Design a protein around this ligand. Sequence first.
Ligand SMILES: CCCCCCCCCCCCCCCCCC(=O)OC[C@H](COP(=O)(O)OCCN)OC(=O)CCCCCCCCCCCCCCCCC
Ligand SMILES: NC(=O)C1=CN([C@@H]2O[C@H](COP(=O)(O)OP(=O)(O)OC[C@H]3O[C@@H](n4cnc5c(N)ncnc54)[C@H](OP(=O)(O)O)[C@@H]3O)[C@@H](O)[C@H]2O)C=CC1
Ligand code: SF4
Ligand code: SF4
Ligand code: SF4
Ligand SMILES: [Zn+2]
Lengths: 94, 114, 143, 206, 290, 155, 178
Amino acid sequence: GVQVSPSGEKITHTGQVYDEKDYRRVRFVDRQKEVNENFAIDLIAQQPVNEVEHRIIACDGGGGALGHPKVYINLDKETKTGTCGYCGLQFKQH
Amino acid sequence: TSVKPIFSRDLNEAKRRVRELYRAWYREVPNTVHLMQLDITVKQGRDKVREMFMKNAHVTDPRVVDLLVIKGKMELQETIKVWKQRTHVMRFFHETETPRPKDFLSKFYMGHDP
Amino acid sequence: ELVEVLKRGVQQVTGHGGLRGLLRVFFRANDIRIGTLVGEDKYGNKYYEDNKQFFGRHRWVIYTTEMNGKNTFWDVDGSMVPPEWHRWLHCMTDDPPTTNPPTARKFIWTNHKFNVSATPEQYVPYSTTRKKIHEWVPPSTPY
Amino acid sequence: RPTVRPRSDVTHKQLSAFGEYVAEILPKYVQQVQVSCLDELEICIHPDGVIPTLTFLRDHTNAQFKSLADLTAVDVPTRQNRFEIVYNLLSLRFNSRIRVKTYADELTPIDSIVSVHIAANWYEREVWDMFGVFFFNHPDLRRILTDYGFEGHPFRKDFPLTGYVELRYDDEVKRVVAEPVELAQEFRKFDLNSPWEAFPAYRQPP
Amino acid sequence: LHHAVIPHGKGGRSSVSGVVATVFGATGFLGRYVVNHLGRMGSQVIIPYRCDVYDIMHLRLMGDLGQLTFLEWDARDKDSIRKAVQHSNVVINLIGREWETRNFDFEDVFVNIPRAIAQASKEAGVERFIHVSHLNASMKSSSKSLRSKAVGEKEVRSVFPEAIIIRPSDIFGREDRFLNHFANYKTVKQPVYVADVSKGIVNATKDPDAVGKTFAFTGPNRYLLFHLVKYIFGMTTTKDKVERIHISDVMPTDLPGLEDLGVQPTPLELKSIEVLRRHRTTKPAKTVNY
Amino acid sequence: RAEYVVTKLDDLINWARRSSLWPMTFGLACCAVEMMHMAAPRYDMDRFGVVFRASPRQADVMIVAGTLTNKMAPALRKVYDQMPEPRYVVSMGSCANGGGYYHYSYSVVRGCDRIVPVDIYVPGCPPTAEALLYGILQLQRKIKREQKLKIWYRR
Amino acid sequence: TYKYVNKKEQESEVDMKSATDNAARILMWTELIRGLGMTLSYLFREPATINYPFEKGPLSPRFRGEHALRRYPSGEERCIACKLCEAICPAQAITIEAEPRADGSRRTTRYDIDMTKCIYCGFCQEACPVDAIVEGPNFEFSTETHEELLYNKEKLLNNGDKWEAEIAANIQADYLYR
Ligand SMILES: CCCCCCCCCCCCCCCCCC(=O)OC[C@H](COP(=O)(O)OCCN)OC(=O)CCCCCCCCCCCCCCCCC
Ligand SMILES: NC(=O)C1=CN([C@@H]2O[C@H](COP(=O)(O)OP(=O)(O)OC[C@H]3O[C@@H](n4cnc5c(N)ncnc54)[C@H](OP(=O)(O)O)[C@@H]3O)[C@@H](O)[C@H]2O)C=CC1
Ligand code: SF4
Ligand code: SF4
Ligand code: SF4
Ligand SMILES: [Zn+2]
């Protein structure tokens, strides 16, 4: 979530802030700093872990198309979860 | 080695073509500052012509000289016929830019200009 | 067949909220047509329809007099139309939200914003990438 | 097959025969006749055969190559004669097309053919303005596409894409001044060519 | 130093010059050149305005994309000057009227507003302040304008000791109130060109040997008012204006001049022709010294 | 107060200046067919008060439509200078906004905002006549939001 | 097969009848009254005009307008920083800069588009293998400065959040053609 810096500037989803001593803060004077308040890194964490009875699981994101390329993930390592490099979802072996 | 020529056999004929071109320019110059209301003086214009001529003095090849004559004639046409403008003619003096200082130190101090 | 025209005209005139509504309409939207109200959006705009007019005038909209703190009684923009009605008003569809509603998803804007080309809440660009080269800082005590 | 292009040999035959025809009529001013897979006939010649060959092809009864579809130049800076010159010609009596090529460089001009085809009056000016190639016996030869004070031949391979100068209005002198080029986003040079050979038929020997 | 200031580039429109300048008085006649000289080398330029947005459009094209920042202000409104002086290294003041309105007297203009500007600059933490005045600035002056100028210079130095005062003489260019004022229809003048003045100021904006000093920017030559007005008429209503007109130009002694910033005088005998051809439908003036 | 009547006077002047917009259509390229389509019936430029095309010597707005080259910049600037104040400019298209598909060329001006000052930028290659109309109405509002007499009064 | 325009099949007749017909055509101004009649007929028809801000012109689910950066239902972004858009964009208008995110994912730190360079060709959404960048329907986004058209990840993500209720429907419509 956007949390403000000493100077009074909102931080972005990639930690960008004009140093308090920076002259580039002028462009915001009498204006605003466009920032997105929905952080994917948190919205995906809010999602739960899927469970499957198979040690290998295919992910596409939803619709066959409208999703992403079908990728296959392994679930032999009960220590952690199996994450998709496209959608961020994570699965377990039960 | 041996070549095929262009509009000349030797640098003497080439230079006399050049001198004819200089006659033409030198003579026409003031009509330009008259037609198009340039600020500069005819002395400045003529010094500029001399500078732009001596800029290509080391040249030796009759062909490389005939081509420069051709291009100068093209420019003189564009100028006597009012196709160029105040802008195109004043694009010779560079009134809106400082030159790269010809000093190792004046270069070093600001940038990597070698 | 001329008296029927005059009757259609008088009903087009009186088909609004009397003289006050008639003037309101005729002076904001220079038009006094009568159509069916398919719906109304959160921001107070109305969307009317009539399939007997020709393609391009068979659907239209009456904007709101206020949008996010702005007197829009005279100033009016096609940017006020939110997306769900934008898609039915530019005739990408034959079905409006009321019957074909959108997909309820979070991170979708609840409050629509119109063009802000000069308002104080406009867009100012900048670089989103952090500093690359970190410099050297010496200590605050000598030798 | 449905994905490949058909292939008629009658045209290859006709054009090879006409190549032999043209070359044995003009053994002088001729070299490197070639007809390609896609059935197009190129004839390479010496810069001294331009008007002879064009006139022959236009007037000769078997040829009647009247229309000058196009005139072009091409810069290959790895050969001493770097400016290829190309005339694309059309004949309606036969529904045929031909290509006549020659070569040139800097300081080594070509002969003009406005006497043969008057369309060239502007194509040759364009070549001079873009590639820097003079033509003999051209009435007017001057900048046609470029600005009036432009110094350079920009369709070469060594002239930079963005150029050397740049224009803007300055209130002090109240004109459109020229200056060096300072971009706010340098054009990016994408290196795409692949390391793996794609066509063996053109594999050069080492 | 902050990496956002390191002057990267080649001295051009799309370069960086490390100069962040808040300029008051840009809607006028000398700012129109100061801002150009600042921006055509890659400087950031904050411009406060009180005019309507139409009268400030001749300045949007003289600087690269994003370097110009136009905001609004009001001299009587404080906290509209912090906005503009903050985020800056240099402040330039060019304000000044040739007459008095209702709300704004010479006192206000030349004493009270510059003082607050310099106060806010010092508060913020900027490192250079440049103020422009008249060559004949003196308390003993028929015109009260010059009185106020010579008072405001001290009122500034009392808050910004390291400031930089610049006293040019009657300035001549296009849209100037001197040659056009004369041609509308005992005293020696040495006028100067806006180009020279702006070059001097923009050079001082970086030059390190200019702080806590003064400069008398005067032309190369001098002329008798009569010879000069006759030259005008050959090439072709305010009491205080006429008073400033009927005063000769001082010859300031050993004061750091124009050629000490690097600039060189541009004689009026070269730009009069371009300034005056507008007022149409010759030999030069004999330069003299008293 | 005088403020009331001065506000009303400015409002009237702006109503006139925005309801009688006359364009000089500096049409250079494929961002001009859209201006023609906008004059065409479906959009009827002339319906708001914007005449189809008037003379560059009695015009109020100036629509730069298409790629501006270094051989054409001086003529555009001369037209802008000849035009009578109060004059406004509208840049229609990527070519005139930043050079567009030819921004990295030697014969193109990377933005008409380097030769003349602009008030409204319309993006597109090409922008529909609907978008150009939106931009012209945005200019109308920019005019309606002026305070000339007010700033001259409280000066 | 060819035809003739402005050629008669054969000579005409100089008969008094035809001569008088042509003389009537000349004197009485006959061929012009028909043009007057065409103009009158057009006066007595219905014009094709529309109230713009109230009546909008018709478009298609394929319209290429303003840009948007999309998300997944979860809310996670879609761009994996593969740069195909930057590599195909003819006008070199897309600048991208990526990094590994603290959660160990391929995601961007910088995604900028220049609307003064985009020719609005759609190649970027043709190339995106995840349907993350889309040239949306909007066309009414004019401005007053050249600096509000230099977009970035934040502006594009805001546009996505704004217009997803329409982009998704148009994509559902058209995705079976591509
Ligand atoms: C008692 C018996 C004897 C009595 C003596 C009198 C007997 C009758 C005499 C006949 C009189 C004939 C009518 C008089 C006018 C004729 C003028 C005329 O014919 O003009 C000729 C001219 C074209 O000539 P030309 O170029 O040679 O033709 C093409 C050749 N292939 O044509 C033109 O160029 C005209 C250009 C017209 C362009 C504008 C047209 C606008 C028309 C608007 C409708 C006007 C209707 C009238 C309005 C009335 C006003 C109240
Ligand atoms: N030319 C000369 O004869 C000489 C001039 N100078 C100095 O040159 C400087 C500028 O000259 P010039 O360019 O002719 O000045 P201009 O009158 O051309 O414009 C000066 C600026 O002052 C601003 N200004 C004036 N009064 C006020 C006020 N009461 N409140 C807010 N802003 C105000 C105006 O802003 P807006 O336009 O927005 O109102 C204007 O843009 C002056 O400070 C003068 O002292 C010094 C020596 C000689
Ligand atoms: S922006 Fe596109 S449509 Fe408009 S003039 Fe340029 S190339 Fe043509
Ligand atoms: S639509 Fe625009 S941003 Fe996308 S590839 Fe084409 S030019 Fe580039
Ligand atoms: S093609 Fe799509 S996923 Fe790849 S970098 Fe571009 S926007 Fe991101
Ligand atoms: Zn997945």
